[PDB]
Amino acid sequence: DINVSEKIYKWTKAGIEQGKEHFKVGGNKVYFPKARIILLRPNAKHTPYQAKFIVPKSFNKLDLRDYLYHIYGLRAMNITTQLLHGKFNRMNLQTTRFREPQIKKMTIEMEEPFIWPEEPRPDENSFWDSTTPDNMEKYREERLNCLGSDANKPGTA
Amino acid sequence: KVNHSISRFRPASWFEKTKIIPPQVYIFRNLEYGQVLYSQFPNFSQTQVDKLFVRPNWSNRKPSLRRDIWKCMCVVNLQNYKQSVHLYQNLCRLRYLRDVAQRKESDKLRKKDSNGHVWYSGQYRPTYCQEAVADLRESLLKVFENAAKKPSIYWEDPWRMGDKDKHWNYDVFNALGLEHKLIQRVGNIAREESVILKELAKLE
Amino acid sequence: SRGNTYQPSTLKRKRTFGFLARAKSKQGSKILKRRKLKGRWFLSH
Amino acid sequence: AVPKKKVSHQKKRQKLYGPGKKQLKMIHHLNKCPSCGHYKRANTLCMYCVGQISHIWKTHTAKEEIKPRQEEELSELDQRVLYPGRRDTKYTKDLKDKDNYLERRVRTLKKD
Amino acid sequence: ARTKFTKPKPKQPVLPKDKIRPPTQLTHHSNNLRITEPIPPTTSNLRCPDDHPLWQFFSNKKFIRSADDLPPSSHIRPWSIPELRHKSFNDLHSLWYNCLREQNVLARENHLLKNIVGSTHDEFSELSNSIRTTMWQIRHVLNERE
Amino acid sequence: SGSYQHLSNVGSRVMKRLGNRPKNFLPHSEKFIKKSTPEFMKSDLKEVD
Amino acid sequence: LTRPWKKYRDGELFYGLSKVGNKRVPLTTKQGNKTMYKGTRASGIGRHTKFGGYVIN
RNA sequence: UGCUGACAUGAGUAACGAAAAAAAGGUAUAAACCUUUUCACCUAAAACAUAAGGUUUAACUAUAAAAGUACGGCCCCUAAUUAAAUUAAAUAUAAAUAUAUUUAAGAUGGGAUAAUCUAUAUUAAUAAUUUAUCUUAAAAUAUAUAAUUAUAUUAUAUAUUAUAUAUUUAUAUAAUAUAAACUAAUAAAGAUCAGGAAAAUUAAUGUAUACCGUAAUGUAGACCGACUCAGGUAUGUAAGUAGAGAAUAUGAAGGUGAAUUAGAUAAUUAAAGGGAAGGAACUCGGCAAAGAUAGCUCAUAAGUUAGUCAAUAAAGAGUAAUAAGAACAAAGUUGUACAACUGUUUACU
RNA sequence: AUAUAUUUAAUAUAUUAUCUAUAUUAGUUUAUAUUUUAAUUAUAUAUUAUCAUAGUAGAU
Numbered sequence A: 001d002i003n004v005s006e007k008i009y010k011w012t013k014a015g016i017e018q019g020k021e022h023f024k025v026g027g028n029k030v031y032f033p034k035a036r037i038i039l040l041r042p043n044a045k046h047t048p049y050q051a052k053f054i055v056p057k058s059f060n061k062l063d064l065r066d067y068l069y070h071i072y073g074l075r076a077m078n079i080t081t082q083l084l085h086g087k088f089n090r091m092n093l094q095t096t097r098f099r100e101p102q103i104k105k106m107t108i109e110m111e112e113p114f115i116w117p118e119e120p121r122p123d124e125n126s127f128w129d130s131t132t133p134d135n136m137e138k139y140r141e142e143r144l145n146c147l148g149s150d151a152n153k154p155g156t157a
Numbered sequence B: 001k002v003n004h005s006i007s008r009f010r011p012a013s014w015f016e017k018t019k020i021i022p023p024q025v026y027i028f029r030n031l032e033y034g035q036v037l038y039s040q041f042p043n044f045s046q047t048q049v050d051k052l053f054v055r056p057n058w059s060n061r062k063p064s065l066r067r068d069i070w071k072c073m074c075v076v077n078l079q080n081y082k083q084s085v086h087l088y089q090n091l092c093r094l095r096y097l098r099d100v101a102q103r104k105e106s107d108k109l110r111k112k113d114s115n116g117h118v119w120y121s122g123q124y125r126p127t128y129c130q131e132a133v134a135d136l137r138e139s140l141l142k143v144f145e146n147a148a149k150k151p152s153i154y155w156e157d158p159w160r161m162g163d164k165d166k167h168w169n170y171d172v173f174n175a176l177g178l179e180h181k182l183i184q185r186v187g188n189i190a191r192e193e194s195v196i197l198k199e200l201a202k203l204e
Numbered sequence C: 001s002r003g004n005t006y007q008p009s010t011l012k013r014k015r016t017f018g019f020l021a022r023a024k025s026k027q028g029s030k031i032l033k034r035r036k037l038k039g040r041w042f043l044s045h
Numbered sequence D: 001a002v003p004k005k006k007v008s009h010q011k012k013r014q015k016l017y018g019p020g021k022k023q024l025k026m027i028h029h030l031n032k033c034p035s036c037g038h039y040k041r042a043n044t045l046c047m048y049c050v051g052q053i054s055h056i057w058k059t060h061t062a063k064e065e066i067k068p069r070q071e072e073e074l075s076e077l078d079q080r081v082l083y084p085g086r087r088d089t090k091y092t093k094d095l096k097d098k099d100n101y102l103e104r105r106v107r108t109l110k111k112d
Numbered sequence E: 001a002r003t004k005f006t007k008p009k010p011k012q013p014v015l016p017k018d019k020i021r022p023p024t025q026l027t028h029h030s031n032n033l034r035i036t037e038p039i040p041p042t043t044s045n046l047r048c049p050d051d052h053p054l055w056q057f058f059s060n061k062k063f064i065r066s067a068d069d070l071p072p073s074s075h076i077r078p079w080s081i082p083e084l085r086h087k088s089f090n091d092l093h094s095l096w097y098n099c100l101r102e103q104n105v106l107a108r109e110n111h112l113l114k115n116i117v118g119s120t121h122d123e124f125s126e127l128s129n130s131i132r133t134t135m136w137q138i139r140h141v142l143n144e145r146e
Numbered sequence F: 001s002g003s004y005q006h007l008s009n010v011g012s013r014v015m016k017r018l019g020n021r022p023k024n025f026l027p028h029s030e031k032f033i034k035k036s037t038p039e040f041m042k043s044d045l046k047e048v049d
Numbered sequence G: 001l002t003r004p005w006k007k008y009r010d011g012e013l014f015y016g017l018s019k020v021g022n023k024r025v026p027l028t029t030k031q032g033n034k035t036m037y038k039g040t041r042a043s044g045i046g047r048h049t050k051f052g053g054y055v056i057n
Numbered sequence H: 001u002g003c004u005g006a007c008a009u010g011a012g013u014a015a016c017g018a019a020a021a022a023a024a025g026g027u028a029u030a031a032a033c034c035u036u037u038u039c040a041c042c043u044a045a046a047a048c049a050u051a052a053g054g055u056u057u058a059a060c061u062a063u064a065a066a067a068g069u070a071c072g073g074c075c076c077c078u079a080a081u082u083a084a085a086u087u088a089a090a091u092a093u094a095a096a097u098a099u100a101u102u103u104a105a106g107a108u109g110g111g112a113u114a115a116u117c118u119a120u121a122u123u124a125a126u127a128a129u130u131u132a133u134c135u136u137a138a139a140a141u142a143u144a145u146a147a148u149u150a151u152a153u154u155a156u157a158u159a160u161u162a163u164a165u166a167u168u169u170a171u172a173u174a175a176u177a178u179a180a181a182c183u184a185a186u187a188a189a190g191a192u193c194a195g196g197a198a199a200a201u202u203a204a205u206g207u208a209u210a211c212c213g214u215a216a217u218g219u220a221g222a223c224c225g226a227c228u229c230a231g232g233u234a235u236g237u238a239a240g241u242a243g244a245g246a247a248u249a250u251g252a253a254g255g256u257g258a259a260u261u262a263g264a265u266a267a268u269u270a271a272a273g274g275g276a277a278g279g280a281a282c283u284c285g286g287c288a289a290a291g292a293u294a295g296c297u298c299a300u301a302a303g304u305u306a307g308u309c310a311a312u313a314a315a316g317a318g319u320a321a322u323a324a325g326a327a328c329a330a331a332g333u334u335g336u337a338c339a340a341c342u343g344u345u346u347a348c349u
Numbered sequence I: 001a002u003a004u005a006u007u008u009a010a011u012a013u014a015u016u017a018u019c020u021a022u023a024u025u026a027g028u029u030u031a032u033a034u035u036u037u038a039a040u041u042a043u044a045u046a047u048u049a050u051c052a053u054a055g056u057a058g059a060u
């Protein structure tokens, strides 16, 4: 016989050949999952063969793999988890400290390369014009943090 | 007892005596900094890393041995063990040149980011990988100049090598049987990478 | 030179002043109840 | 070591604005610039003209912006794939808006 | 420490010429190697499949659903509980999965809207909420039947 | 923005406090809000709960 | 300077808006000793081994 | 010497916290941001890896990637210890509770295998306190006439070549191959202060490898000091040249040149350098500041509790050095009082 | 070595400019040094500079 890694590889290959699961389906069935996954844009370090998702904080690597296969017919060969730090944020400064969410991301290596559709020109799509909200924010800041004779100063926003 | 197959630089004679694997060179990515590490074997220790990164700085950090962040990029099969060895040596030389002797020239070819540092996303720098490809190609060319099994470069990813035109279309390569067969994705390519490598070796 | 009397270590601080430490002992329970009655938002580390 | 009494409005005024030493003088010493009849300080090069000259020198003695050989013919899609533009931190953003914290030399009036 | 006195001892007899071994490796470098500009990877080398299952995270092949290309709330209505009540189990399951899929596409889009542009339009969010309501109704019906 | 707040609900108590502002100090917050909005967005009518 | 738009010495922090704050707050995975393991309702999957491994069930 | 708020006065005063900067270009926007070059500073660190810590400070939202082998946690196992937990009647007690005994928890420690890469699961049967590795012996190299003299070598850590046995892969053998340091493993062994605790084998059947830590900062602007505070803060590597050393000098590489600059350098202050003739005349008191004629090798009295204790003795010599000529180690002799002595003490007189 | 002109029958000679004194391998684990081997990888060459309390000392 042969060693464990090799065996695993063989199993995976067999699964692929079959056109079924390339991993031991857990004998633990959930019928109506409420989980959702966010498909993220790829970083400079990720290849086109890698894609990554924001997944539930309580999501298992195995579970993600399973989920992708069953719901989307996607074979994730290798999966890597990255849990992110929650940074302390506070709004007023008179209000309490608290941490922002611990968020969990997962990179998956697939066989077939994907690339995103190119993001819209800042005009053709109403929503993805990133300027107006920034402007609004700026205006708000001006309104709040102008104290005396800066009330007269002409608006930047 | 202490010195394993990886512990030392291994010449052609040693390989012949042993015959563990076919004559080839392995090239790995650092998957996080974006560095690249060459080797005569599918594994690698600290010593090799040290040899490769003699003069690091904030931009070119001495990378860790972190098992997980070293993923295999290239496996380049040649005809002779000696040839393979030569190629490996050339790669090392190129790396050295890039680092210490002709750093400035190298810099003058990289991509910058307004400030004028080498372009980065986090601590990942794309350019190193590119250099390693280019450098590798150069080394191969040199080897062939110096110079029947047909040579092949097994790629992690078809994407990673620029294009079949422009580069990889030198006459010398054409004259020899330089092939560009991508490795099989099929199973897990990170966890079961060693196994895959072994299989590849067996194939030749 | 005095002044630096608090020498943070997360283990020690959770183990001594933490919620679980308080809740485990009768005196601790009293303290927690007291803080609840005052309406403190934070019952202990 | 210490004031015995609160110093009266008068007294402080006279200490401050009283003597000549402490007063700002009027810059009498200033004259026409030979190249453009604007005001300039005497015995001093006009700051506009010199600046202009410097600019011209820069334009002429401009160093060749060493653009890499690869990135010039690098497909737009390919570029996007490679180098995706991140969001910059607050600090970086602040640094970028130079106009906010950085001053451009003002031009004098025309002497008559 | 070194001082006025200092007799520096020689290194070694360096084993007389004849006694040494021949080095195991003789020819090393290519004393002629050029530093060439890097070769950036190109996407032309790929063949991105059209029916790739990751396209299922987008509406059609589109980064953002435009305000015009969304289903307006005047037309769209969430499923009723009573109506659902007479639906097979399999069909219900299918519906649920569809809903989930839809949410995912909305979800990604919503995230993009929030994190990057920083918009407050929340159409996507509303849609997601509606979907969630339907899902919960379905769940309730399933429980009820049992 | 660049937050991830949407994916979580954290500082729930704090949110509740800031969401359910007592109604007698509603004039305060509203004034501030009015101050920090452009003329075309703002409306003279009082919101209902 | 740390930041060139603030030349003069103000009441500004090297980073953030206030050093102090409520320290009595639920701790996450990121804080604590090496030995502090929090976990995130992800693995009641298999069983730990006598030696350190993990056998999935 | 009311309390809270606001606003003055001192005052546009002191200070802006160990300090090396310059030019050109970004940018007819820059003392302070970035880039290049020059110069400097730290270098057994101001470097590179890390532990703890913390308003994520990072090279950032498209974000810190692990089946495991010079990867950590959890997990198994316990230490110190802890536990409204556990034995008509465990024992005792105004209540609270306390106690011994079991059970569980508890790292700062222990925990199979593994690049000629490795499998932890299930079932069935029957260690180490400290410290040293000398002397001898063996063989090797040269003088002299088998034995003497002098010298280095002597337990382990690979590669190459040549042989004999299974059949290029294995086994064993022989020969060849530097120095001073360090590491690990081996064996042997001296001291009294006598040196942790806790969880078996074989066979059959198995394995799809979970969770979390991972940025940067870490002799510090990112911790503890109310401050971007000359304080406090754990571990490893710490280029060569030199030398007994991690001393001291330099500094290859890396890093850094800073939330104040520019001038001027009065009196005066601090921290230094030099000083004729004097040499303690100063002063409470040689306080302070001078003052070192080898750091290696010799040579070193009285006294004495016999310990080169005194002793690193003073003086003195050998090598080096003849008035021009690094830094660091090294600053005398004697009497008396008190206390044997090394230690401990009033964190902040 | 490369670049640029010259002569020669792309090659070689010589001129000018720029850049270069490296690097890899052996010698039983590591690191450094030495010597070999590889390579174009050098001067008991002139003159400087920096640091060591102005590095130290003699004059000034």
Ligand SMILES: [Mg+2]
Residues within 6 Å of the ligand: B067, B190, B191, B192
């Ligand atoms: Mg692996």
Ligand SMILES: [Mg+2]
Residues within 6 Å of the ligand: C003
């Ligand atoms: Mg305090």
Ligand SMILES: [Mg+2]
Residues within 6 Å of the ligand: none
């Ligand atoms: Mg206690």
Ligand SMILES: [Mg+2]
Residues within 6 Å of the ligand: G019
């Ligand atoms: Mg603090």
Ligand SMILES: [Mg+2]
Residues within 6 Å of the ligand: G030, G031, G032
């Ligand atoms: Mg931490």
Ligand SMILES: [Mg+2]
Residues within 6 Å of the ligand: H002
């Ligand atoms: Mg009163």
Ligand SMILES: [Mg+2]
Residues within 6 Å of the ligand: H013
């Ligand atoms: Mg005054």
Ligand SMILES: [Mg+2]
Residues within 6 Å of the ligand: none
């Ligand atoms: Mg004054």
Ligand SMILES: [Mg+2]
Residues within 6 Å of the ligand: none
């Ligand atoms: Mg002053």
Ligand SMILES: [Mg+2]
Residues within 6 Å of the ligand: none
């Ligand atoms: Mg300062």
Ligand SMILES: [Mg+2]
Residues within 6 Å of the ligand: H030
């Ligand atoms: Mg400038």
Ligand SMILES: [Mg+2]
Residues within 6 Å of the ligand: none
């Ligand atoms: Mg040193």
Ligand SMILES: [Mg+2]
Residues within 6 Å of the ligand: none
């Ligand atoms: Mg560091």
Ligand SMILES: [Mg+2]
Residues within 6 Å of the ligand: none
């Ligand atoms: Mg236990």
Ligand SMILES: [Mg+2]
Residues within 6 Å of the ligand: H229
């Ligand atoms: Mg400090």
Ligand SMILES: [Mg+2]
Residues within 6 Å of the ligand: none
């Ligand atoms: Mg007197």
